[PDB]
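Researcher: We are triaging several targets before committing to wet-lab work. For this one, the compound of interest is 2'-deoxyadenosine-5'-monophosphate. I'm pasting the protein sequence and the ligand SMILES. What I need is the predicted three-dimensional arrangement of the protein with the ligand bound, expressed as structure tokens, so it can go straight into our comparison scripts without reformatting.
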Amino acid sequence: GIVTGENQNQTDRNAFYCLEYFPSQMLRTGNNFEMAYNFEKVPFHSMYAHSQ
Amino acid sequence: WEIEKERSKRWNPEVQFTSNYGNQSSMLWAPDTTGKYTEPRVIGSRYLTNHL
Amino acid sequence: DGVGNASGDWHCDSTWSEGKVTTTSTRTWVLPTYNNHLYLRLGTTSSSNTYNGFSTPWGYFDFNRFHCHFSPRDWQRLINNNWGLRPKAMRVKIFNIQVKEVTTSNGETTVANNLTSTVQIFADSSYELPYVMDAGQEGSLPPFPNDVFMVPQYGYCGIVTGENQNQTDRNAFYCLEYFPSQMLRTGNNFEMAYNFEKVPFHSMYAHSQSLDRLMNPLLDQYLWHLQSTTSGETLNQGNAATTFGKIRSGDFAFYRKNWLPGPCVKQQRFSKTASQNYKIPASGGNALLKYDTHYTLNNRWSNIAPGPPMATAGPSDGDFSNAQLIFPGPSVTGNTTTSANNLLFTSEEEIAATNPRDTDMFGQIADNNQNATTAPITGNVTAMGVLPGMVWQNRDIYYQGPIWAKIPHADGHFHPSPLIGGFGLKHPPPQIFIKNTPVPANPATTFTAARVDSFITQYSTGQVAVQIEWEIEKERSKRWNPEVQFTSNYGNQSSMLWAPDTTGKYTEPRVIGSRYLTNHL
Amino acid sequence: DGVGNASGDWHCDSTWSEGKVTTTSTRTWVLPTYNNHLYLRLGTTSSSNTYNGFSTPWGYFDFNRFHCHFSPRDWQRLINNNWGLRPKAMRVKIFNIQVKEVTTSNGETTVANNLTSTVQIFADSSYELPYVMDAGQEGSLPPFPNDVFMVPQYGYCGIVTGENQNQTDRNAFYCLEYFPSQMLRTGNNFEMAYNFEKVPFHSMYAHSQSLDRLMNPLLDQYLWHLQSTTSGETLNQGNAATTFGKIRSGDFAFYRKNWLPGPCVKQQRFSKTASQNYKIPASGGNALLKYDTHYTLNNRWSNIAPGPPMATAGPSDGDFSNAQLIFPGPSVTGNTTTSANNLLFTSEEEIAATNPRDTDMFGQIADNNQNATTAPITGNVTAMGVLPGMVWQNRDIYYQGPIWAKIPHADGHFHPSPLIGGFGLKHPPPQIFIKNTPVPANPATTFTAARVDSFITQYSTGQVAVQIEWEIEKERSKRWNPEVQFTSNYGNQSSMLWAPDTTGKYTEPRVIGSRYLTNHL
Amino acid sequence: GPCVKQQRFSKTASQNYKIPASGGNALLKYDTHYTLNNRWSNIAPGPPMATA
Amino acid sequence: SLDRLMNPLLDQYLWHLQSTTSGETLNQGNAATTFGKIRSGDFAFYRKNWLP
Amino acid sequence: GPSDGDFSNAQLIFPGPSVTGNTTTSANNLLFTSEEEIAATNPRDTDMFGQIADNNQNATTAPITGNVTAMGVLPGMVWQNRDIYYQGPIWAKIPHADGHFHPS
Amino acid sequence: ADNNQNATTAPITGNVTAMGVLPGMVWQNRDIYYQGPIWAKIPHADGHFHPS
Ligand SMILES: Nc1ncnc2c1ncn2[C@H]1C[C@H](O)[C@@H](COP(=O)(O)O)O1
Ligand SMILES: Nc1ncnc2c1ncn2[C@H]1C[C@H](O)[C@@H](COP(=O)(O)O)O1
């Protein structure tokens, strides 16, 4: 998290995120989890060296 | 829960509940180095002003 | 519609929705007769202050500041609960025109209402004139709705060649009377509408993460780096064996990072305590303008302020630079002060996460290539343009600061955001010009071709109404602990702040920006 | 509609029906320019008089008194024939606006009509402002239709912390120019309507029965009580034998009763003859404020007056308390008088049936538990809250008294009736604010950002019309003998009462409440 | 709930204090009574309160 | 504040007893009842519609 | 106020972060509820409701006024309820009974 | 509690013989009896409290 200056001490700008505050899925030995994702259009990595 | 948005014509800024704790060796309202979670201060619900 | 029918009503309230906020505000204005109805060129030859241009009989409405449209509470609702703001649309109405004539008799000015006199107003939509409304100057609607303000005069600077006043053939003269307008009498009213072009939300929030810390503190990198070229803690002594090592948690300065901090232009640092500063004259051979950072444009020095967005000291800190906007305080009087306590200092330090500090360098870059004989040398970097994969955050808007600016028409731009603050636009809200149509005095009975220089002394007054639909974004974060808010902590006061005092005077006690809510990178 | 077309007509008559009465009344008003168009905060540090707040350029219409809407005869028709009254609906119209300018020349003020000047009026329906119209203060429409009145200034007190002037951050500032209004010229007129919320009929009648007498005088109760603990008529002597007995007609104090008299707050009793009172300074260490009954709110004493409804002396009686409203008499002059004969005293003594007397205790309650050794002891009860099965009757309205009041927005109430009198409402008739839109004087030719402090001196005038539909209940009793009525018994008078005198002055000779007809519990 | 204290009388005649039936000092005076228009009236049974 | 619900500028049409004697000392004076109008600046003596 | 140098049973008391073991000799550890926002409509807990005239004076008898330590509700009385707290309870059950007054 | 104690002043507490109703107060009405009355007429008046 954000460090102000060279010192450890937190200020009021710092944030704490409790991962248990988010809805999840509880799985037993028969359950399974699945998700899908679609990358956003992004330029082709150009794999080649220039000959000029 | 059912709530009512404040609808006042007050001009100057109302009081708010903000974190003024300032520089802290450990963030308040968050676990400490030993994992213990405590509530640093008691805070009621009355901040916004209204008129009789 | 008539002499005895008011042409409009007083609208001045802000209505809130979850998606958007619409702020209407009305003021009363008074418009004199500038320059006795006649254009005047302007110019002065100064070393760096050299300018030339015209001053016009016309005057205009400047709506560009935030407190024109927002009451402090409405500004508190906004910045506390919302991540972003951009104007959707604008609307303006001018009505209740009242044209007065003044007659001095025995040293007594007696104002008498004049019905048939007109007033002529046009909004310039085609951007065919110099646009001065965004320059960050005075003349805006007052903050406080009861105050009544004086419409500013319109004049426009023009291209200066070198350090000399003299115009060349590239200069331009714009006659505002060459544009079609609308002539209004006491029954007529003027109205226009405008639609802002889509522009990115001003992000009102502070980052809760620093760039260099974007990693996971627990793990290590699979990357390796050179730890040292020799044993021992002293320089230029040891056994001179290259030691390669893994990048392990606890050494976070050596991590390989995907992004870089924002650009820099270093600024001079001045101390608010007068004893610490070095003695700099106001003007002369060696003057403060020279030692501040300034770009040289056609042999004319000009300060770079506020300059590119860079982290700044806190408002109460004992130093400041030209990177911090300065506003007058409540207790200030008469254009000059010897103590900084009166003044109210803008501070950017929330952007210290992604941006370098204004009074401190961007970094240090290796100057040479060492060998066993040559020791390494590293110079400071005072100025750094943008590089690929660089991130920065724009300067913050303020309750006193300007809303927008006009992107100068030019072949190229980079990241068009106004360095003072606000919203860069190609087609900003059009300036609205107004003047009192001249009424001649008693003419001679004979005929003469020379123009008539004697006029009835007049002025006009009336109302103006502004409506701007704003579009906002509610904060949607999972942060646990309480965020910072803008609250009134002023405490016990002999007189309420943000309200008139015993003498009726209204001032703004403190300068407050829009960044309170935290967010993460 | 035009300069030469009157915008409204003079309506001022009351029309009666068996179900309801509708009273219209019109007046002429004159509105100055308060505070030279600018807000001013107010405050003073006093031990118990400490206050803070603002004074505004605005002014408002106060319709809240009964004689605004009723002529004495119309008030006589009402209270003589009817048991109850409550307002059904209200309507208000402001018209015939005339805005004048005044110009002082050689010490001569010459008023000249100004057509294009405006006036701006808004009614606050959302109750977004401090509501001062019910506080029981001056500024109401005059009683007599010919008189023309001066619209009062609007200012509002605010929360006082402790005994000190100084505001804290809980205080609020309301800018009346932040609300949308309506700007009126000499042809425009303003109109609004209102619907009172259902509220219990004010019961205008006196009870013909006393609570303790609600029984049948002929019969006896089947209940038994302890008559005496000993023989003989002397205390602490006898044979000490408990004597139980039946409750038999002729002893009515020992009856078992289903109901209790109303609450009490004892008041101090002052005699109108100056020789009988004990000498009390006006202000000082020991002052009259201390010895009167007062609630201590945040270290600030405040009288309790009139206080809860309690029986009071007759108007002509030789004593009075703060429980009796006091009105100025016809012969009073100059804010002070040394003789009570001039003054006109409200009297509640009709409620002596159900309520205790203000200057006398609620009763006496047994202090201890006696035994053969210990004699019984009984203390007075000076203050008693409400208990189950308690009945009381509210304080009476008066022809000079207020019509309504606003129930303060709060978490809880009990029996919301205004202690002065009238109808407690959650949403009372909305205040109507009016001010003269400022007209600037001759401006400078140059530009300056500071606000313009020089204005044309103006005032306005016009008419106002009020209509309130009242709902009434005809008396429906089987009483045989003639009831009391409100009649004019004044007899031979050198000058008619309730009418102008030889000099044109109209005063109200006597204060008369609404309770004449008897009814039974 | 609310209270109005009452006097306590013992059924054994020897324990009570000797109170005449009517006179200067009478039982009506020493019982709890509300004064209505200068007329004393007992408060009985009075508000609901626990009893022996 | 409740006791401040009024308008600080105006006055009440009501009258009250200001003092029973002249002078600032208790139990001394000429013992003349002084009635007066309720005027702005004395806010403790206002007639108020509500109680704390 | 919470930081004031006095308190009563009218103020709820919550344990602080540094408190340990069911007992403490210093109030600084504890966190005190404070109602002082209701000082507008309500009397102070440690101070009287007011002072009520005890007798009826005459030329011989000086007036006497007693304090009021306890006052039930009267007609035309206004008050504001105690505030909820982030640690405080949400609800309560109105006891089943013949009568209530202002069930909060 | 009658007064506000300090190191010098000892606390003093008076009895409460009469107490009206307060917010959040509960009580139960007096019981009917086989010999007792069935009803009563609520006296016609401007106000009542808990008409039993
Ligand atoms: N103030 C301002 N005006 C106009 N254009 C700007 C401004 N700031 C940044 N930009 C440009 C530069 C970014 O690449 C892009 C983000 O647009 P996005 O909408 O986030 O996709 O817009
Ligand atoms: N003046 C005033 N305004 C508002 N509410 C009041 C007022 N006086 C008493 N009440 C409340 C208290 C009673 O229990 C009830 C009677 O309403 P009823 O209509 O008789 O059924 O209304």
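Researcher: Any quick observations?
Model: The radius of gyration of chain E is 13 Å.
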